[PDB]
């Protein structure tokens, strides 16, 4: 150290992730990404969080344990479980590594039916309005609210800071209910500016 040196809440929401042990089940579509991305997933977990990492091929789940003799941070197990789940939900690894690095990032989860009981084409057109052609509308929302959104069919996941994901939530719901696009893009301009301001 330099001579000048100074002298279990789950971040993810909408789903219950929770010597202790934590198991995370990986769906089939994330196995191959997990395999090729496995090389970069265990080091931050084993090294920084000092957790024991196993994943069961038989049950296709990721198993984490707190090591009494090595682990030091009591929240490390839950942070580590949160980090794996983000990679499980569909977020890119670099975004998922943000959860480990920062202490104020939450994942908000909700379903289209929770907003409105839509079926058939109506549900399909609702997913379209969130995505937009070439993902422009989702692209607009993530930059403005400064979040990362994974639109897995009718399952929506929003990653970012608290107020950030509150506003990213409001844009998405207004798209589902069928608000005219002008509010969504037009108001997205204002929320982008107002958030970054000091006053």
């Amino acid at each position: 150290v330099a001579p000048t040196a100074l002298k279990g809440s789950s971040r993810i929401i909408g789903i219950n992730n929770t010597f202790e042990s934590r198991k995370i089940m990986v769906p089939p579509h994330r196995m191959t990404p997990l395999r090729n991305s496995w090389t970069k997933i265990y080091p931050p977990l084993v090294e920084h969080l000092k957790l024991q990492v196993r994943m069961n091929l038989k049950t296709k789940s990721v198993e984490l344990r707190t090591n009494p003799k090595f682990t030091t941070d009591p929240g490390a197990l839950q942070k580590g479980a949160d980090f794996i789940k983000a990679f499980t939900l569909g977020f890119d690894l670099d975004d998922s590594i943000a959860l480990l690095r920062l202490d104020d990032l939450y994942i908000e989860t909700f379903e289209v039916k929770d907003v409105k009981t839509l079926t058939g084409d109506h549900l399909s057109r609702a997913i379209g309005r969130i995505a937009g052609k070439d993902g422009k509308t989702k692209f607009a929302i993530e930059n403005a609210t400064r979040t990362r959104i994974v639109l897995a069919d009718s399952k929506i996941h929003i990653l970012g800071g608290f107020t950030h994901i509150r506003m990213a939530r409001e844009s998405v719901v207004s798209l589902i209910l069928g608000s005219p696009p002008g509010k969504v893009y037009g108001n997205l301009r204002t929320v982008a500016s107002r958030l970054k301001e000091r006053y």
Binding site: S9, I13, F110, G160, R169, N187, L195, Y199
Partner: protein, 873 residues
């Protein structure tokens, strides 16, 4: 005794009080430590600039001073204090009541002699310790051994020996073992001074009957004997510049120099210091330079230099006499009058009983200068009649100054005791003026005043006649004759229209200077003694003979205030610059500050010595006083200038024994709301309403004209990845279930929780309270964020919240501003569902309150109906 408005700051104009000064050398330069009563000042030998002063006044007067490199030792009563850079570092307290008299420091030993012929020795606890602190031993010289101790001196190359010099003889004490190694032979005449010579083993001894003895300690024998018949030696010093000279001071004030090699007198400097005040108290050669410093009890320090010999050969014989080089000085007796020369606190005029007027500078000591009394040549050509022997003018009883015409002609008038005319002075030239003003009624001068414009000087005679002269020519213009007794005060207002006079008859007359008419006449109960006129406020205070200060308003000619409490004469008094206080001194040894608005004494002081004069600075920062004792001026700082002062009347009885808060601090804070039904805006900046309404366009302007070009590879969450505080809405955390559009419980925002709780409690006062606290960007973000989807519960609640606020009649602009922003961001949603009962009912209630707040329109329209008409036609 401790004022709540004023605190001592320093003494000005005091350079030495007669205690022998001490010389200390830092490298090449030399510094001189001088005593001023209860404090000491350090002067630089090169320029005689003031460097440092002791932080605090010692409890008792300083007796002896010795300096050694950075550290300076000052001895008062039984305590010896060590000072570095004027900061006390350590205090050596002796264990006996006997007062210390002499002080010697050689190496790591410190020697202090008490008046009971007891010598205390202190030593350094450690070899590299800076100053001696520990108590080593105690040596006492009995009457059998020798008489009283004259001084303690240490000769070079004497290992742990102290040369104690007594009236009877000289003794040699070995401090380490505390044994008397040697006692000198008895000397017939009482010894008064000792000095170690640059030669070895030889110490110069000054007797009471004009003998100087080069006594050789090693040989125990006399070497030489000077005779100075009919004299008393007070100081001695050798010249170390390579020429064998000796400077002998005498109590008569004469300094003599001898050439020891030639056995002859170089010169004598006569009356360098007054004989009355102790003459040459100290006179020391600087180590290895041709310059000799001298001091005396007359509050002066001088320096003399020996120039090189004019003869190319035999320079030793042809010795130039010493030449005055530089000096610093002050009054020899207490100042009689003071006055501020300038609007700023730079310069001070002081006149003393020593018949000299001085200009003292508060900002720097060097700038202080004496007013020369050399007279200008008469215009007529006649010879000016005066004694050929030059004698200073008599002391100055009264004085007046103006700066309207500084530099153009004379601007100061001074009156003298038992003198039938007033003399003029010029500040810019620092020299007496060319005009003399005569009373013209065979009467002495008792009052002097000047107009603000600097053109007229008023002189008040003891026989009741007021004369007016013109300053630029000194030609009499007018003469007023109302009083039949002595006039003791004159003043002219700022406008040079109304003039006021007061005399021992107790009468105050009001004259109109322009028309020369008597406006009115006022009689008081008792004789009047002095007057001060405050030009800004047109109030002037009279020190009546019944121990009362009477304030009178010149415009109306009536007594407005009368102050009582003084136990004796009022020697002097002054107004505060703002016109709100009067500080008066009296012979009961007190200074009382009177609050004119409330007419009571707010502060009181008890000074040890009566205060002859008190004068505020025109700025108001400083207050200066002069006292019956002490050659300097006491300067005080007006603590009121940095914080408020309570105006509660002082306790008279408690003061004698020593010898509604918003009224009390002369402030008032506006109520939040005068009355419930009265409209009121928010307690804050008025730009907040405008900023909220036009937030977007204001922001649009602010943006840079060209985009900032940024790196492609940038962290997405940089704002959040901030090592740690920002308080923005973006930096908010949830506080601890079915998904809800507004917020999932445990994940909702603070504002939403307040709204829902308010909706249940039917009281949104908490939500309205926090609404006002938000920043404008926060407010726009939240009103945006309201749920706009059926059943429209959030929007309906929000309208209820604002509607309740409008009933409060407080902050009604912000509520209006909020309800505008509600329409901006949710105008469409309200419009589509205007038939919905929940929205319509809330809107109707808001309108019902809002319809009431239309009286404000009527009032505003009426005033412009009349203000435009009244201002125009």
């Amino acid at each position: 005794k401790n004022s709540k408005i004023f605190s001592p700051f320093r003494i000005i104009g005091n350079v030495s009080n007669g205690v022998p000064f001490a010389t200390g050398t830092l490298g090449s330069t030399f510094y001189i430590v001088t005593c001023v009563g209860k404090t000491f000042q350090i002067y630089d030998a090169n320029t005689l600039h003031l460097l440092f002063v002791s932080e605090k006044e010692t409890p008792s007067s300083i007796v002896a001073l010795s300096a050694h490199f950075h550290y300076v030792y000052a001895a008062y009563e039984n305590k010896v204090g060590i000072y570095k850079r004027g900061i006390e570092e350590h205090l050596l307290e002796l264990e006996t009541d006997a007062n210390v008299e002499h002080l010697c420091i050689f190496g790591d030993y410190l020697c202090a002699s008490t008046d009971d012929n007891s010598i205390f020795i202190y030593k350094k606890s450690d070899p590299q310790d800076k100053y001696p602190s520990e108590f080593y031993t105690k040596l006492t010289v009995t009457e059998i051994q020798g008489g009283e101790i004259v001084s303690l001196q240490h000769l070079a190359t004497y290992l742990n020996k102290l040369t104690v010099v007594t009236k009877s003889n000289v003794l040699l004490f070995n401090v380490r073992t505390g044994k008397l190694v040697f006692t000198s032979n008895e000397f017939p005449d009482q010894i008064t001074t000792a000095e170690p010579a640059p030669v070895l083993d030889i110490i110069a001894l000054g007797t009471v009957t004009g003998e100087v003895i080069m006594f050789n300690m090693r040989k125990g024998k006399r070497i030489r004997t000077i005779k100075i018949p009919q004299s008393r030696i007070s100081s001695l010093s050798f010249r170390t510049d390579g020429s064998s000279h000796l400077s002998v001071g005498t109590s008569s004030g004469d300094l003599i120099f001898y050439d020891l090699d030639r056995r002859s007198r170089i010169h004598v400097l006569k009356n360098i210091h007054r004989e009355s005040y102790g003459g040459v108290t100290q006179a020391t050669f600087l180590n290895g330079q041709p310059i000799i410093v001298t001091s005396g009890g007359d509050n002066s320090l001088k320096e003399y230099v020996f120039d090189p010999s004019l003869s190319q050969g035999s320079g030793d014989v042809v010795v130039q006499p010493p030449r005055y080089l530089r000096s610093r000085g002050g009054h020899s007796q207490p100042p009689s009058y003071i006055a501020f020369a300038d609007s700023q606190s730079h310069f001070m005029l002081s006149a003393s009983k020593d018949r000299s007027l001085w200009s003292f500078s508060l900002r720097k000591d060097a700038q202080s200068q004496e007013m020369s009394q050399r007279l200008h040549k008469k215009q007529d050509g006649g010879r000016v009649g005066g004694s050929t022997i030059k004698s200073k003018f008599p002391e100055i009883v009264a004085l007046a100054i103006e700066n309207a015409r500084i530099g153009e002609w004379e601007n100061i008038i001074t009156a003298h005791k038992d003198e039938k005319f007033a003399r003029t002075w010029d500040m810019r030239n620092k020299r007496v003026g060319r005009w003399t003003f005569d009373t013209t009624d065979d009467g002495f001068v008792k009052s002097v005043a000047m107009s603000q414009c600097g053109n007229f000087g008023f002189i008040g005679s003891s026989n009741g006649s007021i004369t007016i002269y013109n300053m630029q020519s000194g030609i009499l213009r007018k003469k007023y004759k109302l009083h039949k007794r002595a006039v003791t005060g004159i003043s002219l207002d700022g406008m040079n229209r109304k003039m006021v006079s007061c005399g021992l008859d107790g009468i105050v007359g009001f004259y109109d200077f322009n028309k020369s008419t008597l406006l009115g006449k006022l009689k008081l109960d008792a004789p009047i003694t002095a007057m001060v006129y405050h030009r800004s406020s047109d109030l002037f205070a009279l020190a009546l003979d019944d121990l009362s200060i009477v304030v009178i308003d010149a415009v109306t000619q009536r007594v407005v205030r009368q102050l009582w409490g003084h136990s004796n004469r009022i020697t002097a008094f002054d107004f505060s610059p703002e016109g709100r206080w009067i500080v008066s001194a009296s012979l009961d040894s007190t200074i009382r500050t009177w609050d004119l608005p409330t007419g009571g004494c707010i502060d009181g002081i008890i000074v040890d010595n009566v205060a002859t004069n008190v004068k505020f600075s025109p700025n108001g920062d400083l207050l200066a006083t002069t006292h019956v004792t002490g050659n300097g001026i006491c300067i005080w700082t007006n603590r009121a200038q940095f914080k408020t002062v309570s105006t509660r009347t002082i306790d008279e009885s408690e003061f004698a024994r020593m010898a509604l808060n918003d009224i009390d601090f002369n402030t008032y804070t506006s109520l939040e709301q005068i009355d419930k039904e009265l409209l009121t805006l928010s307690i804050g900046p008025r730009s907040k309403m405008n900023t909220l309404l036009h937030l977007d366009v204001i922001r649009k302007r602010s943006k840079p004209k060209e985009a900032p070009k940024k790196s492609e590879k940038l962290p997405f969450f940089l704002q959040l990845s901030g090592e740690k505080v920002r308080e923005g809405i973006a930096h908010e955390t949830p506080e601890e279930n079915k998904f809800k559009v507004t917020g999932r419980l445990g994940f909702e925002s603070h504002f939403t929780k307040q709204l829902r709780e308010g909706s249940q409690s039917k009281d949104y006062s908490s939500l309205l309270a926090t609404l006002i606290n938000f920043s404008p960007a926060a407010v726009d973000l939240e009103i945006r964020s309201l749920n706009s989807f059926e059943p429209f519960d959030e929007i309906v609640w929000f309208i209820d919240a604002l509607t309740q606020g409008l009933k409060s009649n407080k902050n009604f602009e912000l509520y209006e501003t909020f309800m505008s922003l509600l329409f901006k961001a949710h105008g469409d949603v309200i419009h589509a569902n205007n038939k919905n009962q929940d929205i319509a009912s809330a809107l109707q209630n808001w309108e019902d309150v809002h319809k009431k707040e239309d009286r404000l329109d009527d009032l505003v329209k009426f005033c412009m109906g009349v203000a435009a008409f009244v201002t125009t036609a």
